[PDB]
Nucleic acid binder design. Structure first.
Ligand code: ZN
Ligand code: ZN
Length: 55
RNA sequence: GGACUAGCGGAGGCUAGUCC
């Protein structure tokens, strides 16, 4: 238990850290970062991918 | 508060509902 919100995993939540699917940044082993899982630039995000569209 | 169901999210919170 502890953190029922974790149930979000029931929707193959996406890791906002690495940008994978199956775990969240919270449950992400990687350190708290902000590397666009699109271009690989640390600072911006996919939503604001200054490289290319967001799928 | 908890747990679910939902739902979205670059941030995981929020609410509702039911239960006490
Ligand atoms: Zn991750
Ligand atoms: Zn980018």
């Amino acid at each position: 238990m502890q953190k029922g919100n974790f149930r979000n995993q029931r929707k193959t939540v996406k890791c906002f850290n690495c940008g994978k699917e199956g775990h969240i940044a919270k449950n992400c082993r990687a350190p708290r970062k902000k590397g666009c899982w699109k271009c690989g630039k640390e600072g911006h995000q996919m939503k604001d991918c200054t490289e290319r569209q967001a799928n």
